[model samples]
Target chain A: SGFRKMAFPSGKVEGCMVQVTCGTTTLNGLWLDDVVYCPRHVICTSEDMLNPNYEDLLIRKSNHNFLVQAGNVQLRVIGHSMQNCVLKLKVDTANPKTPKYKFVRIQPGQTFSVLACYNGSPSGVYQCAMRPNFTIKGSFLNGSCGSVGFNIDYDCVSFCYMHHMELPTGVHAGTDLEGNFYGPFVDRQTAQAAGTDTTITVNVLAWLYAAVINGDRWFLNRFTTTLNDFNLVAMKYNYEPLTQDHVDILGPLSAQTGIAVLDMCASLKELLQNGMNGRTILGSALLEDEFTPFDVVRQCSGVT
Target chain B: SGFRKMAFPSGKVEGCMVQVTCGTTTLNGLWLDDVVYCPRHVICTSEDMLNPNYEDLLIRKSNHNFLVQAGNVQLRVIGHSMQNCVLKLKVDTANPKTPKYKFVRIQPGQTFSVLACYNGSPSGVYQCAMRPNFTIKGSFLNGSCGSVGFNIDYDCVSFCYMHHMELPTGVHAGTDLEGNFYGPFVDRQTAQAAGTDTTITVNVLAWLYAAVINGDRWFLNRFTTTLNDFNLVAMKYNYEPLTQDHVDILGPLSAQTGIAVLDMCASLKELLQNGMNGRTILGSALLEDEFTPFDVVRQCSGVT
Candidate 1:
């Protein structure tokens, strides 16, 4: 029963986008379309009950007023209309009674971006709302009432899910199932930016996961290269890569949706490559994990 | 045997002075005239041994070139006949190998004065020599080799000796064996001047001792009045007077010479009554003793 196959419709979503580039292969598509499901209604006759699907079909209420797009390291709030509208936003509801708000003014047909950079342990839920204006009473208008919420599941355990591989154990010897592997799998950039390797590596692992799950060997190789690079970076900072012991804890359904994984990977890659120097993010990522290679070796090796 | 009655001749001797201001009953004479004894002599007959006095009598070498006069707080170096002579003096001998020398040039029949002021704990000696000039070798001439050295024994204990009283005990309760007494003996001048009081108090006390031992009750009363004035000055500075506890510790013979005490008393009295509003010497004296009535009470009474 837990192995039930899930179905995904092929269509364009209101705000979602997906792109994949693995070596010579590339794919681009939308993961979700404007769709809604309605609760069951008993007012219909036996004929209606016989065709329950048609009877239960609900009209899709378009939330085209504002669209929210969450990335690995950013959040985008796009304004559908209004030439120069001021949109107020808040994340994670710091204060339930009167939450703090952030404002972003967007011109007509423009997007406002927020760096949704959070690296707290075990991750947290991100609830974002875009309002035309913030009221003293702290309520958004009907159009702005539509809020988007998502859980940023980040942790050492979730790291395996991101990578779509067995939790590593012992050492991370960059080798495929066939046993052949590239020597010195890491690069200088990744090594130097080892502090933020968690964010960088996990996102890369997620991209690798998507590639492997989609049977793109080239993509998997590229993802493996990125992973090796991260591991080398980690080693430079005195940390070991994910071990097989880590993967053993994962279940069969540890893998996440390909589009979500790819999106997060793309965001993380952008953040590492272009957002800032790799050191800052990597350093922060290492801190979020709350353990260094020293800590790991001390704890796992049974040495005090 | 230690209490042998020593006889002194009634005549003027080299480097000695005689004066009397005792009372209605006065004794004027040199305590020791030109008398010297050799350490050992042999090749004498039994008749000479019978008259051992003649055999033991040594030649009297006259040191008439320079005479040293040490007052309670002042030192006078009298040049007998040296024309354009330099008299060098050192107090406390801070440097023994190369003692710091204070020079005073005097014409024939002139006396050079040095305020041999020193007020540290315990005490030290004063050494003076009449030298034609200071040599790099740091020695007086053959005749100047007859240097005069005297102890400037000072401190609270010496303060008792200078005053010709018994060593004191417990609470320094300015009291004497006689019921008739004075009250609150120390004054601001003496109290504040207590540091220099070692120099000053010992000198004053020595003067007081000389006056009393010489039986000059008139001078004694004057000295007592001076003591009372010092006590009053110390009181203005919030300090108690010298007490019997201070006197008991001095030896039976603790008094200094008479003229020196008189001179110092005159100087000190003048300084107290007319010089610097009685604060300078008082302050320096306080530093020497390192305590006041306030310090005494605070330290001794167990109140922080």
Candidate 2:
């Protein structure tokens, strides 16, 4: 059965930082819990068993060194797939108090380390285990069962894992949304500056998914100065799925937006306000009457 | 010698209303004046030159028919040029005060007609003349006049008179000039019946030569809504042509047009008044700073 609980120890190991350095190798698997597991090996083959490099076999080079000292130690390495190489000291083999037990080489995927001390003093071991195939793949290890009668002590070993990942689908950045507008054309400069509105509106028109919402036509009336009082009236009142009610609304709306009518409003407000008049025309009502008389002429020309 | 002015007394010849019906014999020229002398050898062409079947040529058929009386008209089958037909009337032919003799026939290229009223009215010996291919290419009258003529009174004929006899190029009975605008639009009904300024504005947008003009971008601001603010500012000054100055003017002008920057003046007296506000902004000591945030954006945007 797997251990019921996991434990962590306190205090730092002392030593000349035991370091393990290994190089390029192709390792397959290591026995953990009585089973040989190879992440890369999908299935066992007859040839795998016969070949020197079986899916589970890893080639090791001894030239690379692992330095160990007598007291609490730290370890590190620059190698690929260096896993499960055991190391033991020449002296005491088993003794938790002595801090001498086992050390195993580790490759890059997942890793572990250990720390130990006696009488609140230094004594520990360092180890790292990992699998590699031209590149480091994974690491595994078992923690010593308490400071024990052992040949070496293994502590903190880290596995450096790497992966070549691909970009995921449906993730996009830096794209433009549709129907953006800018500025009120206060004058010719404003109007011309807002010229890009033409290009933008074109895009909007091209991509518009539904009939215009809000008083789009009214807005147009406000934008174009050419519209006459009557045209402005038509523009303001012409609504979706046009009806007779439209004609009724047009008169007042035109009265508000029509330049002439608006001019009158300007005069009335000025005279009444005792010279403290607001010169603004509300675009909402005004935009409604933004059509040309020719609109009707063109419309009725042939019908009659 | 032709008399510059002649006088005659009105009188009616007794039993003067002699009626002659059209007959097969082609009538020759009516001798109004006495013949100088009888033909040395009276030789009449044996050929019956008139084709009675040619009724289209004989009787004009449009709105009216010919009628005549008061004449001892001799009918004679003359030559192929049915134009030789004439009528000699013995009625008061010279009295401008009470002229009472007449003859009628359809001239070629004309729908012929006649009138007969015997209450002492104007009358004269009339001749009908016809010319085939009168307007044909290379013919003397081809470039000048079309086929047909009726010599009623040579004394009354002149170049101006001859000029009025030709056919008209084209004719239109009733035409109105003021309201006529044609176009290339998809739906005219919606364009005309728009009920709100918004609706009409959108319809008007359809007419924008520039796709840049955005209907969605427009909104109501204070300047246009107020009675005199914009108008007053515009009228107070003259608009300078677009320049750095004009660009400068746009800001304060926008303020005036946007809000009641103009006080007391409900209506701008003229465009120049509004232009005054523009001049203020453009020509101001601190023109650069005077521009509204909106105007600043507009100026930058319009730079291209």
Candidate 3:
């Protein structure tokens, strides 16, 4: 009975910066062909062990020297510095059920990290490392140790943990809950410069677990975009569940953030807006939906 | 006691040409964002009236002046030669439950036409023209007398008719059965020169009705693509039901007729193939799928 508050053992690592107007800044997410990647900078932890948000913490590690983990599942950094950095990951240890591991060793290029992103449904399949580069499969995605992104089963790692860390700490330096940052990280300049002419694109979708004081239901119209990413911001920011009705109207939205991912939902959300003009992140052009960063957030007006 | 066949009061409009490799050429079709269009060519007719192919006979009338009618619903030709052509279509006369229409008159440019595609389902909505060239809605699609292409409801008019007609005859000249000619009409040199650059793409999908000697289930892995189109070819070709298992492997597939659609099913079909070396129309790469047409066909090999 030391601390009956029971540290709920659950909390998502959230990275933020009051850098924009949406009440927060994003930690940079990658809207890949299939998965919405949470950058190494974004982090998370659990909310409650008693009522654990068992959303297997998905960590999509980038191709850089770093330390990442979930419970006993993890990717450890070997060697030193970003130069000639080698890595080791436990491939088969993720399935909450029948967990095992085939040690995977390789150089860290663009790597994949995850936690069966479902609420309770888990993939009981045991995956072994493919060696060399692309080695490993999670209940929701697959990845080669040091290769480009392949395909995955689920849509995104809407959460990450910042509070948790391992020795030889692997990740972008200096980021914490003190601020709010989360999103598909990309500089339009760097992006459009890489893909098809004058344009680059990504799909964005979202979800939310609304366990309101009275009616607990999922607030997501559909699951796949900003909602989940934002939910992480709230959970990590306040370390609890969403309990109210509030809109996160982010600003300078399309400028830097480029909220061009939710093609359908945004349009649907927009369909119900003005010009019938629906609401997109912050801009009104192709792909330039969220930007003008320095994102923002709030705990709850009970802040009173 | 009249004619056991009873003329099968039900029939589809199909257009075909067997001069090509898949054993036939196609009557131009338009692969739009939502629907797969049957060329004004792929002709079709019903197999039985006692069990009428209640699937509404969808007629996608084209621009050039002409006549088109489905049972009581009709698009009459005011004059001919397609010069300065003015047209009249019966809107709202398609609902099988309660059919009616509001007269729509206008100068024809790029018009729309439809009946219904679902083998059994029907839309109960009655639509009126949205003047100034936007559209009139049908249970499945919508269109105006003149204008650019808009959006629609169903996936496509998978079938058409050839043995039937009411054109000042609205259409491209000469094509008729005793031979085959169907598919979205377009010459590559003409297509690439229009959109994007050095590249152009269209999706191809297929469906089949499985009324075997006994199984009587829909054989199509799914609907919308070559299967339905091909079904039309077979039905229009023999005026009967399919009764066996056979594969249609056309030649120089990608040359003029790029069999590149079916991103999923084809792979599924191919996943079950070799090279696994999936199979596409006659070619590889992007749009260069189908070409070399004289296009060819048959009335069933019971010819023996």
Clashes of each: 58, 107, 148
How big is the positional error of residue B198 in model 1, measured in Å on the Cα after superposition? Answer: 99
lDDT of 2 by residue, B177-283 (tens): 11111111111112222111111111111111011121111122233323334333333332111223333433343343342222212222232233333222111
* Number of the top-ranking candidate, with lDDT as the measure: 1
Worst 10 residues of 2 chain A by lDDT: A170-179
Candidate 2 residue lDDT tens string, A1-304: 0000011111111211121212221122211111121222112132442233422433332213322222334222223232222222121222232222223333122122222222212222221112111111111111111121111122331212111111111100100011011122110111121111001111111111111211122112222222243233333333122223333333343433443333332332222224212222221111112122221221112110
Among incorrect, acceptable, medium and high, the docking class of model 1 is incorrect
Candidate 3 off by > 4 Å: A1-228, A231-304, B1-249, B254-304
Q: Comparing to the true complex, what docking class would candidate 2 get?
A: incorrect
TM-score, predicted candidate 1 vs. hidden true structure: 0.13
- Please give the CA lDDT of all the candidate structures: 0.21, 0.20, 0.20
lDDT of 1 by residue, A7-57 (tens): 111000112222211122222211122211111121223344333342232
Order the candidate numbers by TM-score, best to worst: 3, 1, 2
Q: Quote each prediction's TM-score.
A: 0.13, 0.12, 0.17
Q: Name the DockQ score for candidate 3.
A: 0.01
